[PDB]
């Protein structure tokens, strides 16, 4: 679990969005596993606007942060799950690192700000949904 709080927006994994996120829907994209909802309170976070390929992510299944080298956002095949059919997820970045299903929502940050959130993983890999291209969040 986890979310990004920027301005009057809350960014979460689309597959983990609550009834309240859907009732205050701003934008969603199944192909990116992202959903953005509106908030009444002003958020705590700032978004990176950069091309960093190194950063640090929070891994809830280890209660720890780990440094990572990650690939550029791209279209990656993701096997079927209880949440989505087998499909290509876009704007996804992969890295070598530990992750388990409940780790989705953990923030990936570089020196410039928030880069994205954990969205996929398995077998020593961790995948992050990029948010740096969503300029309207600012
Ligand atoms: C087994 C490790 C692991 C680590 C991290 C996450 C997962 C689960 C996973 O990747 N899913 C299920 C939820 C929706 C995801 C998607 N973006 O399509 C795909 N599994
Ligand atoms: Zn950066």
Swiss-Prot record:
Zn(2+) 1 binds at residues 50, 52, 110, 112. It catalyses: Selective cleavage of Tyr-|-Gly bond in the picornavirus polyprotein. Disulfide bonds: none annotated. Transmembrane segments: none annotated. Cysteine protease that cleaves viral polyprotein and specific host proteins. It is responsible for the autocatalytic cleavage between the P1 and P2 regions, which is the first cleavage occurring in the polyprotein. Also cleaves the host translation initiation factor EIF4G1, in order to shut down the capped cellular mRNA translation. Inhibits the host nucleus-cytoplasm protein and RNA trafficking by cleaving host members of the nuclear pores. Counteracts stress granule formation probably by antagonizing its assembly or promoting its dissassembly. Homodimer. This is Protease 2A. The chain holds residues 869 to 1006 of 2193 of the full protein.
């Amino acid at each position: 679990s986890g979310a990004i709080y920027v301005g009057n927006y809350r960014v979460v994994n689309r597959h983990l969005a609550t009834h309240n996120d859907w009732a205050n829907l701003v934008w969603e994209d199944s192909s990116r596993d992202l959903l953005v909802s509106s908030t009444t309170a002003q958020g705590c976070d700032t978004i990176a606007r950069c091309d960093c390929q190194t950063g640090v992510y929070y891994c809830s299944s280890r209660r720890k942060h780990y440094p990572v080298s990650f690939s550029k956002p791209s279209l990656i095949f993701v096997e079927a799950s209880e949440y989505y059919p087998a499909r290509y997820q876009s704007h996804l970045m992969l890295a070598v690192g530990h992750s388990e299903p409940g780790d989705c929502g953990g923030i990936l940050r570089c020196q410039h700000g928030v880069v994205g959130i954990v969205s996929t993983g398995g077998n020593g890999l961790v995948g992050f949904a990029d948010v740096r291209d969503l300029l309207w969040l600012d």
